[PDB]
Amino acid sequence: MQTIKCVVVGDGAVGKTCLLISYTTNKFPSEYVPTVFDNYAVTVMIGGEPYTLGLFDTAGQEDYDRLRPLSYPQTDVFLVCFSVVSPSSFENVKEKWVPEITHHCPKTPFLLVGTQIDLRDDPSTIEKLAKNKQKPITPETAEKLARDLKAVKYVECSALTQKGLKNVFDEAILAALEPPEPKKSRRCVLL
Amino acid sequence: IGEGMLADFVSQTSPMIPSIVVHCVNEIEQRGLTETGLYRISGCDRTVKELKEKFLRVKTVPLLSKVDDIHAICSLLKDFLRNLKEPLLTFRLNRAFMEAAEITDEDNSIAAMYQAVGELPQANRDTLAFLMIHLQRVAQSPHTKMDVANLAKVFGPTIVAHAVPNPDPVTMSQDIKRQPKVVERLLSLPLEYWSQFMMVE
Ligand SMILES: Nc1nc2c(ncn2[C@@H]2O[C@H](COP(=O)(O)OP(=O)(O)O)[C@@H](O)[C@H]2O)c(=O)[nH]1
Ligand SMILES: [Mg+2]
Known part of the structure; x- marks a missing residue:
């Protein structure tokens, strides 16, 4: 059977878990708890074909830097997430996350994923950012980093409203399939 | 880079704590301790590395x-x-x-x-x-x-x-599962207990 392994990575609290849950269950998680490691699954019907999407949740804390690489093997595509309202989480995409996966999975595709876009209109949020003379990341800025770092695409979403949620995964599915070279050439390998 | 042992960073004898630790804690507590996600949210990596260097x-x-x-x-x-x-x-x-x-x-x-x-x-x-x-x-x-x-x-x-x-790889995944429970106990010990090591002398 054709299984698609997708591994989600990125700073802590950006919403990795929330998007995996909201997507797969249409329910937004209320709890505030850090993710050590987890993996969900879903059968998708694209092109009229049955595809199993294996989703892998990981810990963004640097404390788990040695345990995270354990979920990489056999990955078909990476979802590198950052919060559109956390400039630093966007920063760590080039300073840490992209460097990490390309060092472990040189041949594996990855999509830049901006999360929590609904928060671009949050009164409290915008003000805390300006308080530090900062502002949210615009789609245009992200799209540029996307190209610069050779990401397949830039997509964003709100796990809360699900705006652009399904689409993120659709593109994540196409990225593992659509290419002409065999699915094998993109699957990660240890060492 | 690489760092040495904990003791290689202590200067005072009482209590035996690194200034680096003391200063980070003081600053974190200084800013109020009301920011959501303390220790859960990553600082800017470039910044953390430059301060470290x-x-x-x-x-x-x-x-x-x-x-x-x-x-x-x-x-x-x-x-x-x-x-x-x-x-x-x-x-x-x-x-x-x-x-x-x-x-x-x-x-x-x-x-x-x-x-x-x-x-x-x-x-x-x-x-x-x-x-x-x-x-x-x-x-x-x-x-x-x-x-x-x-x-x-x-x-x-x-x-x-x-x-x-x-x-x-296996032993590692094992330790990680066990580490949390250890920290829980330590945190459950009375403040009085921890405080006694804080006296200078
Ligand atoms: N407003 C808003 N909050 C979100 C969204 N996604 C996640 N969050 C919140 O961001 C914090 C961390 O979420 P989580 O999914 O655990 O991020 P993770 O640490 O990468 O797993 C929690 O308060 C989530 O409820 C979103 O789309 N909109
Ligand atoms: Mg999580």
Whole structure:
């Protein structure tokens, strides 16, 4: 059977878990708890074909830097997430996350994923950012980093409203399939 | 880079705690302790590394008063701890600590914890005490949303860690599952207990 392994990575609290849950269950998680490691699954019907999407949740804390690489093997595509309202989480995409996966999975595709876009209109949020003379990341800025770092695409979403949620995964599915070279050439390998 | 042992960074004799630790904690507590996700949110990586590089040169603790994103300090602290040549609870006591937390009987577990702590070199006990007191405060601030269990999930890999430099893939995944329970016990010890190591002399 054709299984698609997708591994989600990125700073802590950006919403990795929330998007995996909201997507797969249409329910937004209320709890505030850090993710050590987890993996969900879903059968998708694209092109009229049955595809199993294996989703892998990981810990963004640097404390788990040695345990995270354990979920990489056999990955078909990476979802590198950052919060559109956390400039630093966007920063760590080039300073840490992209460097990490390309060092472990040189041949594996990855999509830049901006999360929590609904928060671009949050009164409290915008003000805390300006308080530090900062502002949210615009789609245009992200799209540029996307190209610069050779990401397949830039997509964003709100796990809360699900705006652009399904689409993120659709593109994540196409990225593992659509290419002409065999699915094998993109699957990660240890060492 | 690389860092040495915990004791290689202590200058004062009482209590035996690194300035780097003292300063990060003071700053974090200074800014109020009301920011959501303390220690859960990563500071800017470039910033954390630059602050670290200045420090590690000759062990000159930089001014953190003006670092605006407080998370970069939380990250700078954990980074300092996590990179010591040996974890805060030391290699020698790694298992001891883990199995003292797995004792299903709360009390006896509490008792074996006291015994293990008392085993640590003074620097680690003092430094650990300081931290437990600090975090118990963090856990007590509603706004942080970082309860004992959350802190335990984030600090466990850092101060507990492993019994050897390079664990194998399986043993590693095992330790990680056990680390959190250890941090939970430590946090459950009375403030009075931790405080006694804080007296100068
Ligand atoms: N407003 C808003 N909050 C979100 C969204 N996604 C996640 N969050 C919140 O961000 C914080 C961390 O979420 P989580 O999914 O655990 O991020 P993770 O640490 O990468 O797993 C929690 O408060 C989530 O409820 C979103 O789309 N909109
Ligand atoms: Mg999570």
